[PDB]
Subunit: 158 residues, 2 copies
Amino acid sequence: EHKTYEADLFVWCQQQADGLRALSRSRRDLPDDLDLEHIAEEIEDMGRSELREATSLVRQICVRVIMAMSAPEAPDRARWRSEVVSWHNLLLDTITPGMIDRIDIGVIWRRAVSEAKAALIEINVAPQAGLSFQAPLPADHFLDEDFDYDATVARLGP
Amino acid sequence: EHKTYEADLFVWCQQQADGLRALSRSRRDLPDDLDLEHIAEEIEDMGRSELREATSLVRQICVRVIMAMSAPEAPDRARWRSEVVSWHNLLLDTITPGMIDRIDIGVIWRRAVSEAKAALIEINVAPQAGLSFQAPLPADHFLDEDFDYDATVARLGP
């Protein structure tokens, strides 16, 4: 189904790149200086970049969730929570319905554990003893408009 | 003059956005689901983003130049120089001939001085007494493939 620019930017990038190529490869009377092939490549790549950004924001949220699981009384948690709210709001502006299935929590959570362990060593905190590289919650949990940092930390303890 | 994607990405973005709009606004028989207006907006914006990136890299280089002017014997200079080489190589991959005139050293150097002063306070170094918000060198100096950090620092002392 066709998606508008506004309704689903991610799907629009792929549909528009495909449409540009279809037009370019069919018509023999378009202006030669109009570079539909590289335009399509750039539009397609912008879609990929949106997904990379959403993926990164979920990762960063997960790192702070894991850090609070390891240091649940850290005074730093107030800052971590503020960061998470900021990232999550940006995530809600970036995700689209067609992008949801592409958010790979299995890969993201693994990378978040590796990153969180390094960051914990830096602040001289030992990681959760039970800390697992296996995602405990689906991607949807973090994409939820009502995602709650402190509730998530509490449910993933102790 | 028409510029290819490879020859000048920055000029290509503007020429292609203009060409997309010209085509869209003239033909009555293009596919309705092909969104040439928003494609043109995105392509145009990518051009702007390239210039923003180049501008940022020149700024970051200037900050490290100013920091070494204030702390010319700092052991940290080796790291600063390494950072500058990395940023400068990325800058050389980003700049294009049509973008050169848009690199505004008067604005960039001012912002670099403000940033450098804050960063110097953090490392407990007083700024150059003669440190000026007025750019002492043209944008071209930093865009030069043969830009030399240490030579620049030395010429801007003492």
